[PDB]
mmCIF file of C-alpha atoms and ligand atoms in Angstrom:
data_model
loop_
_atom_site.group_PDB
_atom_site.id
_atom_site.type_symbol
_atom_site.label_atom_id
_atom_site.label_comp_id
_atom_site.label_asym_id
_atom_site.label_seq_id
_atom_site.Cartn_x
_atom_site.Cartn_y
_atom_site.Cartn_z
ATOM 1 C CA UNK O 1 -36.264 129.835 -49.841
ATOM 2 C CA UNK O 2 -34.594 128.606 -46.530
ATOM 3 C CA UNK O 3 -32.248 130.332 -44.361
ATOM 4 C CA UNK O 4 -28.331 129.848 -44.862
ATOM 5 C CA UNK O 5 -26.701 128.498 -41.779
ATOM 6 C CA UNK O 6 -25.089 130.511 -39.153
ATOM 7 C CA UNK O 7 -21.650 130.534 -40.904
ATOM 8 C CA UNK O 8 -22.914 133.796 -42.834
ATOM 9 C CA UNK O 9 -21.459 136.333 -43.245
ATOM 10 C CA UNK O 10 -22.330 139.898 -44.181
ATOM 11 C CA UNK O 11 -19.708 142.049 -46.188
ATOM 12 C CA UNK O 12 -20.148 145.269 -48.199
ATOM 13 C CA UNK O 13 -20.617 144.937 -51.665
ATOM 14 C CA UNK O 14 -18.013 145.194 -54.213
ATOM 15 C CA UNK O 15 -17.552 148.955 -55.041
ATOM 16 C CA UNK O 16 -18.670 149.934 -51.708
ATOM 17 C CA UNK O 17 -16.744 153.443 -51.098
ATOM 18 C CA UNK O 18 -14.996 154.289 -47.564
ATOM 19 C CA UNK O 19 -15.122 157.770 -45.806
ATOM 20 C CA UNK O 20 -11.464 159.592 -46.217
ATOM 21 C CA UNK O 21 -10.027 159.704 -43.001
ATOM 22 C CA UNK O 22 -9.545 163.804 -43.032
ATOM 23 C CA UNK O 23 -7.089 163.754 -46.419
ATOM 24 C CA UNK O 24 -6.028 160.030 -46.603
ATOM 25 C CA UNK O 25 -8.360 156.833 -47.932
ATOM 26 C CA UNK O 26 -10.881 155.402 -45.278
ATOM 27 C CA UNK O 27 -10.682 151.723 -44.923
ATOM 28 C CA UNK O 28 -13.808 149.066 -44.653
ATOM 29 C CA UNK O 29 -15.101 147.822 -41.613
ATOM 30 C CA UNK O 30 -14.472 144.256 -41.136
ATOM 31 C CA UNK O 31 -17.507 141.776 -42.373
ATOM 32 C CA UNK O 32 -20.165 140.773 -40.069
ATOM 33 C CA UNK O 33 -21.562 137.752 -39.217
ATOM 34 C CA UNK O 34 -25.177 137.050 -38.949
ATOM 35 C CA UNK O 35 -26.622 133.748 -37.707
ATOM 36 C CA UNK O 36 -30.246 133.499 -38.717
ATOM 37 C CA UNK O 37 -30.908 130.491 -35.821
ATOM 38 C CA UNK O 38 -30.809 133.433 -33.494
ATOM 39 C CA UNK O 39 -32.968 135.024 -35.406
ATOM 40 C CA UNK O 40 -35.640 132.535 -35.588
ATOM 41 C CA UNK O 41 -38.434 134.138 -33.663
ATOM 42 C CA UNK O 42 -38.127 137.448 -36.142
ATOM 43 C CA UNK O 43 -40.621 136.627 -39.126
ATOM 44 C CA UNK O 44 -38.413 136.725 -42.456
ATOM 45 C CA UNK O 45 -40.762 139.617 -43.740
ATOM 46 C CA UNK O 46 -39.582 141.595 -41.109
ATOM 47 C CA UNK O 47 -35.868 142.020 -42.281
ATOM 48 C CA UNK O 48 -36.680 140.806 -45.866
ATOM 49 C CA UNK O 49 -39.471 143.551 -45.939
ATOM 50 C CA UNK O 50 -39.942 143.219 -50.050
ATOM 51 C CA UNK O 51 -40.376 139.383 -49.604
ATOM 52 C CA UNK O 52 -44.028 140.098 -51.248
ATOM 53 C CA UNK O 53 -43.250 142.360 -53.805
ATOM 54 C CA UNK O 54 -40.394 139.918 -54.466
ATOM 55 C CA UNK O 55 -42.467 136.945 -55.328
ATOM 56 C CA UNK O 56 -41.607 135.061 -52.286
ATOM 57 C CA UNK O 57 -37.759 135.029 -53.361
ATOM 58 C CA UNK O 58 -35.304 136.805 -50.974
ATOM 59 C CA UNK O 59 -33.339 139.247 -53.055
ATOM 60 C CA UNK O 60 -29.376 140.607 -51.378
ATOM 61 C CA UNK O 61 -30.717 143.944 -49.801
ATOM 62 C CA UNK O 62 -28.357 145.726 -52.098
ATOM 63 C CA UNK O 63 -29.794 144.408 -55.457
ATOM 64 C CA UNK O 64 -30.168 147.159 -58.139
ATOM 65 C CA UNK O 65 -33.221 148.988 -57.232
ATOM 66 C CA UNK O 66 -32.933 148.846 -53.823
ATOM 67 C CA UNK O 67 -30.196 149.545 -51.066
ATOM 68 C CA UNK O 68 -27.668 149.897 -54.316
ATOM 69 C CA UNK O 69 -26.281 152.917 -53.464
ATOM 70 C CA UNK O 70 -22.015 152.884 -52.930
ATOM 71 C CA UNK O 71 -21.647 156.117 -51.840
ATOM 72 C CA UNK O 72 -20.088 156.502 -48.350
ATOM 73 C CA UNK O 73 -22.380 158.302 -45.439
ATOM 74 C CA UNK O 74 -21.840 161.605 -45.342
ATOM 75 C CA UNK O 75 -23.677 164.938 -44.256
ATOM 76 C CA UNK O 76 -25.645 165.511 -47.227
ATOM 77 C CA UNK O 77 -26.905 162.118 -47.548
ATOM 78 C CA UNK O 78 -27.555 161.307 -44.117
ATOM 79 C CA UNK O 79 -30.819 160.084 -44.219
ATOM 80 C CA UNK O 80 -30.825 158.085 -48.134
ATOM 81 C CA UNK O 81 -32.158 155.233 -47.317
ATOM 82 C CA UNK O 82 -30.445 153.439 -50.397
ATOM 83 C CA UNK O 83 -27.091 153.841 -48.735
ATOM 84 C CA UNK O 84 -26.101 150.680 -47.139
ATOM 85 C CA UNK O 85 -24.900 151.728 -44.236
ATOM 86 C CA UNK O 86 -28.336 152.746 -43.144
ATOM 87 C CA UNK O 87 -30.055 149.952 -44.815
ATOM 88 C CA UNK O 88 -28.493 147.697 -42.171
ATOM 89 C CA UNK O 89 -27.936 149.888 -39.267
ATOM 90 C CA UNK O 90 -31.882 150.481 -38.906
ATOM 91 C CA UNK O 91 -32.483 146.908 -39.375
ATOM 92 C CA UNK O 92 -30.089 145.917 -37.132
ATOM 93 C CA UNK O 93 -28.779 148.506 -34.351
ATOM 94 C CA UNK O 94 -32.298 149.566 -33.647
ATOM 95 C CA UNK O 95 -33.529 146.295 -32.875
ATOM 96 C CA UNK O 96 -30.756 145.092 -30.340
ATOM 97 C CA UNK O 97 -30.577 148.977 -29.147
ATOM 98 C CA UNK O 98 -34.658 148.732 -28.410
ATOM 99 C CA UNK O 99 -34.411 144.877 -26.595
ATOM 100 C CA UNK O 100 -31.428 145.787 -24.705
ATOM 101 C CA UNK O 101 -33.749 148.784 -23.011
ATOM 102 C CA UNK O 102 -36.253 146.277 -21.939
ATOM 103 C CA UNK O 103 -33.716 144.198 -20.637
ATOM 104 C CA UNK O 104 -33.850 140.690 -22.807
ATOM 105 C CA UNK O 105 -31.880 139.045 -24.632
ATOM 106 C CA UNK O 106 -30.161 140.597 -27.136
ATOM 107 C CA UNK O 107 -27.310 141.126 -29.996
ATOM 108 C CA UNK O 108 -24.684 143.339 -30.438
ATOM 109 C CA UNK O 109 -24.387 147.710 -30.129
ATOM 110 C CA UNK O 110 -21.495 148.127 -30.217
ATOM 111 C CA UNK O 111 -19.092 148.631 -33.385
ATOM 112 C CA UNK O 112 -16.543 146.231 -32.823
ATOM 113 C CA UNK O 113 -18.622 143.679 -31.495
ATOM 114 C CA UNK O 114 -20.825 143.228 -34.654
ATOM 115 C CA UNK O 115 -18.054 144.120 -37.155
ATOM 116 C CA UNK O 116 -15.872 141.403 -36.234
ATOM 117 C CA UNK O 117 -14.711 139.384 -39.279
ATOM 118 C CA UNK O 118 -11.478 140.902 -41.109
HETATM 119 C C1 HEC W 201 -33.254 139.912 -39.657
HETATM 120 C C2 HEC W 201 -33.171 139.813 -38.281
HETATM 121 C C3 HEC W 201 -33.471 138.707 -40.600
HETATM 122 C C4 HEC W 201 -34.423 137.740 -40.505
HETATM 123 C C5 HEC W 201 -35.455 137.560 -39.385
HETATM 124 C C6 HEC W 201 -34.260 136.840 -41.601
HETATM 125 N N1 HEC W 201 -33.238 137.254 -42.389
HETATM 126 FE FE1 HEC W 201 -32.467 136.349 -43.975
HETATM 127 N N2 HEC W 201 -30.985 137.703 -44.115
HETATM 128 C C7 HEC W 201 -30.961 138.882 -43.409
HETATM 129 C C8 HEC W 201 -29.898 139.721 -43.878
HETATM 130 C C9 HEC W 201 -29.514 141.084 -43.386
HETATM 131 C C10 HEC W 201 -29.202 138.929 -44.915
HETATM 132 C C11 HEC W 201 -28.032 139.466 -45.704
HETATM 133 C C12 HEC W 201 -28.618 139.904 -47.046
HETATM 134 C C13 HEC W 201 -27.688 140.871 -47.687
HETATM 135 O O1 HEC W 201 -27.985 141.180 -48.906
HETATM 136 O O2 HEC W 201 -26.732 141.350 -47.012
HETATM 137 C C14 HEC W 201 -29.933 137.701 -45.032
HETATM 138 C C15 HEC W 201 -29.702 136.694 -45.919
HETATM 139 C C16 HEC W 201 -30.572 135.724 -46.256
HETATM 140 C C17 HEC W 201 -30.486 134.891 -47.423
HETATM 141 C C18 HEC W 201 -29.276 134.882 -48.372
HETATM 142 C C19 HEC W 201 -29.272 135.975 -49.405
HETATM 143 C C20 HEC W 201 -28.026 135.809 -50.243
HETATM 144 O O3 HEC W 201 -26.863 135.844 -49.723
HETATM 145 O O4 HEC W 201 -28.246 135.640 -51.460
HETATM 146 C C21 HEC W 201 -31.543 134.069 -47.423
HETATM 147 C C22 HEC W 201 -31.929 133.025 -48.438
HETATM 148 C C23 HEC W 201 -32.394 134.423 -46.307
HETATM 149 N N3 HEC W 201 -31.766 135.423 -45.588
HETATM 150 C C24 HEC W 201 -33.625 133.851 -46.007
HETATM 151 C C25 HEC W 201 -34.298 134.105 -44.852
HETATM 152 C C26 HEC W 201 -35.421 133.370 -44.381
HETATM 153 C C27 HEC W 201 -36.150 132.306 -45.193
HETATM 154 C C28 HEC W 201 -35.814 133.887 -43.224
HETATM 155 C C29 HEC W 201 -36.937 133.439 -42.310
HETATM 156 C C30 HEC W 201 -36.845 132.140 -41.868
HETATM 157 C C31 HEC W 201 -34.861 134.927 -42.905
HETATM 158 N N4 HEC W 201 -33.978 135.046 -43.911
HETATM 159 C C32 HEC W 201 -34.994 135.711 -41.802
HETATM 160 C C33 HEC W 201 -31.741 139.229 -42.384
HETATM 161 C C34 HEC W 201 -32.768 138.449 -41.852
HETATM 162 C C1 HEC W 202 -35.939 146.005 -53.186
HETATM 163 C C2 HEC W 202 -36.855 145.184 -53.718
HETATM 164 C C3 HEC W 202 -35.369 145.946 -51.716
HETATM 165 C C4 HEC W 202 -34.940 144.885 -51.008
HETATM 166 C C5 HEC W 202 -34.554 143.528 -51.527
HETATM 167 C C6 HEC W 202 -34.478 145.387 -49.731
HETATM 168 N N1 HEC W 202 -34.848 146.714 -49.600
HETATM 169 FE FE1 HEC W 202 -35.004 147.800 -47.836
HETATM 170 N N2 HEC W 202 -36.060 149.244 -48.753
HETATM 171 C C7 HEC W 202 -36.260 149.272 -50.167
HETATM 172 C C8 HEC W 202 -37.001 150.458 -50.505
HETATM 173 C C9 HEC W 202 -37.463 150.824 -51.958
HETATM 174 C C10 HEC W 202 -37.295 151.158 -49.192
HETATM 175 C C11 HEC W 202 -38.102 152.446 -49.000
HETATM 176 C C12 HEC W 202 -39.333 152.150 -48.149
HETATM 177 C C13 HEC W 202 -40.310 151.155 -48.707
HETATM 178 O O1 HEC W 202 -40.833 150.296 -47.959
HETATM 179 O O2 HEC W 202 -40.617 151.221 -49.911
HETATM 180 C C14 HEC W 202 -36.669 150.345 -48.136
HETATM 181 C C15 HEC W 202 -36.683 150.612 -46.800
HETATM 182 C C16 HEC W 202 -35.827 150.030 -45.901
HETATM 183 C C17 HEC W 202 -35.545 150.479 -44.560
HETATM 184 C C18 HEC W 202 -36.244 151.638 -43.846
HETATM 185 C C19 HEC W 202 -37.555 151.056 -43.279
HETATM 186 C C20 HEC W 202 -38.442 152.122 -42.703
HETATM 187 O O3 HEC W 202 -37.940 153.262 -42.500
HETATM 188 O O4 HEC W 202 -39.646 151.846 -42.449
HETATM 189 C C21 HEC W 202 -34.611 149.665 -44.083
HETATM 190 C C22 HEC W 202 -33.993 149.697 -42.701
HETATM 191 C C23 HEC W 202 -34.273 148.684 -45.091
HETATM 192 N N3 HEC W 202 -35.061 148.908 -46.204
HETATM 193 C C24 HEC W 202 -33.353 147.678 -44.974
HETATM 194 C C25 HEC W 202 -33.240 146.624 -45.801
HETATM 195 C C26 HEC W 202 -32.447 145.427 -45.584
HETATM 196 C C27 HEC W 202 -31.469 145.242 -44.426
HETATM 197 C C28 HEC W 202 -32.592 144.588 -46.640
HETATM 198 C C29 HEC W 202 -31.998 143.209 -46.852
HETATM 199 C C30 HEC W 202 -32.323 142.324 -45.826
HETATM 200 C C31 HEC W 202 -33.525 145.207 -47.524
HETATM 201 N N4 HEC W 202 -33.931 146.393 -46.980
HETATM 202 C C32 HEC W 202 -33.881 144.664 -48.727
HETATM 203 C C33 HEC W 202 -35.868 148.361 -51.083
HETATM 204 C C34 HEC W 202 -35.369 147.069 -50.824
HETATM 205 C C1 HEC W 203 -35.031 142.135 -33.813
HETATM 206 C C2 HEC W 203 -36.034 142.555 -34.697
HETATM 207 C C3 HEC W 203 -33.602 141.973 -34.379
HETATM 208 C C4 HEC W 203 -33.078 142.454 -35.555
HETATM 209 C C5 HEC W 203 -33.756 143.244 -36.690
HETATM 210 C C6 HEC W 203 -31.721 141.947 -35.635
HETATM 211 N N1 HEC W 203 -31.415 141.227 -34.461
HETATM 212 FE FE1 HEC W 203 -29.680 140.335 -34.086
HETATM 213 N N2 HEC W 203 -30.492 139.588 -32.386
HETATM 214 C C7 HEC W 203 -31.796 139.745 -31.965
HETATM 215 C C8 HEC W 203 -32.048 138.961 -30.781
HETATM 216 C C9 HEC W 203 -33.383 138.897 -30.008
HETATM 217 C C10 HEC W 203 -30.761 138.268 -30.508
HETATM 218 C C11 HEC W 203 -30.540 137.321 -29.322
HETATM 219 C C12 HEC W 203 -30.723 135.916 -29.790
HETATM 220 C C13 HEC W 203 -30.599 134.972 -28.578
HETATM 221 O O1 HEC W 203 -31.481 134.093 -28.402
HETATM 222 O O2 HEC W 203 -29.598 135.093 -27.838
HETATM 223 C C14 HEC W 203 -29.850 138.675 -31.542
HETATM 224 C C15 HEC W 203 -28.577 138.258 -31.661
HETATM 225 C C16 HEC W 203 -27.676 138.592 -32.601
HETATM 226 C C17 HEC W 203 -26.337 138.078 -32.736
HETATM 227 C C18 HEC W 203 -25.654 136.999 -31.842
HETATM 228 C C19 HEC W 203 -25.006 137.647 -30.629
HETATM 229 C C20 HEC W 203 -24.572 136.528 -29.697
HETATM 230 O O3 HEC W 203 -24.808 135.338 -30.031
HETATM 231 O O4 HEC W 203 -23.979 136.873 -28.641
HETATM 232 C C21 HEC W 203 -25.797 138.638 -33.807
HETATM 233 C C22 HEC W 203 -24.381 138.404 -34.358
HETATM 234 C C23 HEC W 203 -26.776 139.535 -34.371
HETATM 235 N N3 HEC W 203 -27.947 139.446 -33.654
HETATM 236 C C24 HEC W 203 -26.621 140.309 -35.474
HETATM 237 C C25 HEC W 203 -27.562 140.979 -36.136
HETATM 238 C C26 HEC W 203 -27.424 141.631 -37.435
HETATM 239 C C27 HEC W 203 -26.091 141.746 -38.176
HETATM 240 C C28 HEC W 203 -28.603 142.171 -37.741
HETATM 241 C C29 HEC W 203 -29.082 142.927 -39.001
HETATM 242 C C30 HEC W 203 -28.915 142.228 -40.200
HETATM 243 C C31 HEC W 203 -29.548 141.803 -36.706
HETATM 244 N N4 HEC W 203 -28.900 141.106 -35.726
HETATM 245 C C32 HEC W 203 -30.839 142.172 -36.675
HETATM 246 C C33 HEC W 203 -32.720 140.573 -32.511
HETATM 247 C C34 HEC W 203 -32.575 141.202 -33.727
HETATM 248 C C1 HEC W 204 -24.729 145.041 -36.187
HETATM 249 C C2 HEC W 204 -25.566 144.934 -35.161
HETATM 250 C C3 HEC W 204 -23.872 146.286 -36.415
HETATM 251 C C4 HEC W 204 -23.434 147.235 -35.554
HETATM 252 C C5 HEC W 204 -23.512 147.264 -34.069
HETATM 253 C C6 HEC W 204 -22.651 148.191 -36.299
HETATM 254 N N1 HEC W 204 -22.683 147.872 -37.609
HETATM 255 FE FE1 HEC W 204 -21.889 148.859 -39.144
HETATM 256 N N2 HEC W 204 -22.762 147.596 -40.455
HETATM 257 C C7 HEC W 204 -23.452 146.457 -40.102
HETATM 258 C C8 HEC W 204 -23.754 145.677 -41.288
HETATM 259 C C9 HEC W 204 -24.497 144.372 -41.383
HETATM 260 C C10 HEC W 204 -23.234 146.467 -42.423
HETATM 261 C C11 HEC W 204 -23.235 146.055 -43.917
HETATM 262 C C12 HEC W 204 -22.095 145.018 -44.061
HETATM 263 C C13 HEC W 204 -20.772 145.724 -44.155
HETATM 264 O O1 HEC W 204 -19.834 145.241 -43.544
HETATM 265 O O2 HEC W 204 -20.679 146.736 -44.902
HETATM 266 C C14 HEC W 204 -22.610 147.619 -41.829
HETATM 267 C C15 HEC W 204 -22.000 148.632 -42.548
HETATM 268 C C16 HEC W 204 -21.276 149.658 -41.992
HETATM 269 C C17 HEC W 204 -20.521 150.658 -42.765
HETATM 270 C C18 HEC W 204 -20.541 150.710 -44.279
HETATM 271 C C19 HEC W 204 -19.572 149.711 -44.933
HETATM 272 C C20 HEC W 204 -18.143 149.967 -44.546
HETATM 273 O O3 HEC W 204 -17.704 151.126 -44.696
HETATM 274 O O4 HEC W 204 -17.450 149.033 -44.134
HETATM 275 C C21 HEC W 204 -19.849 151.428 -41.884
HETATM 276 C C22 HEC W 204 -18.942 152.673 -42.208
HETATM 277 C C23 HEC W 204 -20.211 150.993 -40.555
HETATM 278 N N3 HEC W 204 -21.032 149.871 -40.660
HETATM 279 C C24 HEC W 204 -19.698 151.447 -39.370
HETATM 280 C C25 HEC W 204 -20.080 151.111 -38.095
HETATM 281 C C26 HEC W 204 -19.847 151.888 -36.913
HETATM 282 C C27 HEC W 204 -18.851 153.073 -36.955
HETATM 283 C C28 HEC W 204 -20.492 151.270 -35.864
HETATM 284 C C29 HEC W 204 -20.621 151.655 -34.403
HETATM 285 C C30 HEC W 204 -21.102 152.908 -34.163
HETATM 286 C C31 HEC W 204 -21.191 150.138 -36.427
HETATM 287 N N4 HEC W 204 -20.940 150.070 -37.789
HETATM 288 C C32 HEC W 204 -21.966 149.274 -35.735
HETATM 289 C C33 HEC W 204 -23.798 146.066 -38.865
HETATM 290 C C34 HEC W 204 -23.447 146.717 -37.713
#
């Protein structure tokens, strides 16, 4: 496969469920976009990390069987990796967080600055 162009965006899969804010309904965060052109010195394996298992075919991340969970993060299931919110938050947050400390370029930390889209 190739890479889709940088108009891409990322959005939670249909289903996905929102933390209550105390007693009332959480809300989604807004979609994020992800150009892959600025990610063209990252080897597709290393984000697509079942590419081999896979066949060579690059499957959505939360395809049944693997990040397919829509449960919202909570205490008790912290650390599920099947959860998509830390699917993409390792992938994504920990690289930025870890080239921002050697001071290169990088892409965004912060919240609002990733989630922008919605
Ligand atoms: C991380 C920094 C990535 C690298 C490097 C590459 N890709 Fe990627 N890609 C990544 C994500 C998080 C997503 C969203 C997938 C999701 O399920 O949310 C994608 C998407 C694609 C897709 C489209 C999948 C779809 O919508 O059906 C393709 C075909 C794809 N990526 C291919 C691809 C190739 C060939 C790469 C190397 C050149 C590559 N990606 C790198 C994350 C990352
Ligand atoms: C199924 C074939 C999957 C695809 C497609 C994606 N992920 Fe995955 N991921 C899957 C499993 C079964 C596991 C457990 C560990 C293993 O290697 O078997 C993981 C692991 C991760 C992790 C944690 C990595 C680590 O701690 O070393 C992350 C951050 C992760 N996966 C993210 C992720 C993303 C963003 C995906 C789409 C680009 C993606 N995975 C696809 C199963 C599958
Ligand atoms: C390293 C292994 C990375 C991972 C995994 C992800 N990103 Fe990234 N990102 C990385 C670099 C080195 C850069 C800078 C590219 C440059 O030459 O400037 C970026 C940049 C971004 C950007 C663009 C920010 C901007 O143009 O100001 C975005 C929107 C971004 N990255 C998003 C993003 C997402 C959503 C990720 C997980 C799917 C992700 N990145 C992973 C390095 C790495
Ligand atoms: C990219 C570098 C991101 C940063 C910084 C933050 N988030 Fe994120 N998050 C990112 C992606 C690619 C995804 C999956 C796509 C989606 O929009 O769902 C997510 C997912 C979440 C979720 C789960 C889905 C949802 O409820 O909308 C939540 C609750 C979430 N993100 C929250 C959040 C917070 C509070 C952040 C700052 C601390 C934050 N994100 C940063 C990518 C990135």
């Amino acid at each position: 496969a190739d890479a889709p162009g940088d108009d891409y965006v990322i959005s939670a899969p249909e289903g996905m469920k929102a933390k209550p804010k105390g007693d009332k309904p959480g809300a989604l965060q807004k979609t994020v976009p992800f150009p892959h052109s600025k990610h063209a010195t990252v080897e597709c394996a290393q984000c697509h990390h079942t590419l081999e298992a896979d066949g060579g075919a690059v499957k959505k991340c939360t395809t049944s069987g693997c990040h397919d969970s829509l449960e919202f993060r909570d205490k008790a299931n912290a650390k599920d990796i099947k959860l998509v919110e830390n699917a993409y938050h390792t992938q994504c947050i920990d690289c930025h967080k870890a080239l921002k400390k050697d001071k290169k370029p990088t892409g965004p930390t912060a919240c609002g600055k990733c989630h922008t889209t919605n």
